[PDB]
Structure 1
């Protein structure tokens, strides 16, 4: 399928457009292009300050009949350095011109803050709630005390930073792992490199007639994780969604275990 099923029963499309901050219009143009190309999952974050621009792109898509709201999966998030959680969600919804989010994520120094998230879930303002950047240990601690378990833990995960421990823990507990920076970042790559240049990935890409980035994304999807590639290039945006009608054979998948980790 082109989705995973969360512990709430909702479907999360396995490819979404990741979030970042750019110059005026760049992110909105990417959102528009991505949805027109077939993306049904857009990741956002209030820290980037650009939710109003994303909301304008989504409003254009809906008014043009590209997609209905119900067909989209829209995530946003808050990072706290509890009373401000519903105000922040309230503000994200206003900027995005939405009545609900499919997913709302939080990070905090970890619990009353999760209790606030649970209230918003119960109210339907966030159809699923989860966390950002929680290790196995912190996710387990939260699971031990929460009434509503997190649906998602969104973390950096790519072939050079495979999150093997968290991956297994999410499998055992039913929390879904969404991979941000799925095409790598220098700070989580061996010797500050580029994981798309790893010879194992290039070799597999060459065998299958795919780009290195397509291979990296398909690996994460085969591991059971959704992915949030970022690109402003329409050809790459298209390639990055073309990760469903083929697979990495098991013998080649096994080679990912040899990629040096940061």
Structure 2
């Protein structure tokens, strides 16, 4: 498919637009271009200070009938380290107001780490303000600690994952536990890796396409970021072809960062 299914049963489109900060309008324009090209998944973070701009882009898309709210998968994330658990629902409330949404499909949190911070997340899940809840940057050990005590297990662990940083341990642990791994920075320069250039030539694809497809074939969603409209489109062209097993195996020889 063009999606994975989370432990909640919800579908998460395999490709999303990644989150970042840029000059005024740049991110909104990317969101708009992405969704027009077929993206159904947008990753956001209040830390970038741009969720109102993204909300303006989403609002345009919806008003224009490009997509319905229900066919979008919107994610936001909170970095809550050393803040109160009570701040969590307030931040979600703010993100919803800025994005002009009634619910998030996914809300992710980081804190140092029964944890009351996670408790606050569970309540938002119970309420349907966050249809799925997860974590960002949790190692296998920390993700396992959380799984051992949570009432609602994390749906997602969003981490840096790419051919130069393959997260092999965490990938195995997510697969065994049913937590879905979303790869941020899925292009890392790993696009100059000769193994990737070679596979790209053998398959008649770009280096980025190969790198993205590799992650998808490990069962991971990917969050490529681009301000270029053509690269936005190419970053979605990861579905109607695959990397064969013999070429997929060569990824094991790439040097890790």
Shorter chain as normaliser: what TM range? over 0.9
Q: CA deviation at 1:235?
A: 0.6
State the SS of the aligned residue for 2:97. helix
State the SS of the aligned residue for 1:35. helix
Write the mapping of 1:71-150 to structure 2, written as runs, cut at 5 A. Answer: 71-81=71-81, 82-109=85-112, 111-150=115-154
Aligned match for 2:190, one of 188, 195, 200: 195
Aligned length: 253
CA–CA distance in 2 between the matches of 1:211 and 1:219? 12
The TM-score, its normalising length taken from structure 2, stands at: 0.98
State the SS of the aligned residue for 1:231. coil
State the SS of the aligned residue for 1:155. strand
CA–CA distance in 2 between the matches of 1:120 and 1:80? 15
Q: CA deviation at 1:208?
A: 1.0
CA–CA distance in 2 between the matches of 1:38 and 1:79? 29
State the SS of the aligned residue for 2:9. coil
Structure 1 unmatched runs, 5+: 184-192
Structure 2 unmatched runs, 5+: none
Q: CA deviation at 1:5?
A: 0.3
Q: CA deviation at 1:209?
A: 1.2
Q: CA deviation at 1:36?
A: 0.1
Q: CA deviation at 1:27?
A: 0.1
Q: CA deviation at 1:207?
A: 1.2
CA–CA distance in 1 between the matches of 2:22 and 2:235? 20
State the SS of the aligned residue for 2:242. coil
CA–CA distance in 1 between the matches of 2:72 and 2:182? 16
Q: CA deviation at 1:254?
A: 0.2
State the SS of the aligned residue for 2:77. strand
Deviation beyond 2 Å, 4+ runs, structure 1: none
CA–CA distance in 1 between the matches of 2:231 and 2:201? 17
Q: CA deviation at 1:179?
A: 0.1
State the SS of the aligned residue for 1:9. coil
The TM-score, its normalising length taken from structure 1, stands at: 0.96
State the SS of the aligned residue for 2:74. strand
Per-residue CA deviations over 1:62-91 (Å, capped at 9, x if unaligned) read 000000000000000100120000000000
Q: CA deviation at 1:120?
A: 0.2
State the SS of the aligned residue for 1:247. coil
CA–CA distance in 1 between the matches of 2:200 and 2:29? 28
Q: RMSD of aligned C-alpha atoms? A: 0.9
Q: CA deviation at 1:148?
A: 0.1
Q: CA deviation at 1:58?
A: 0.1
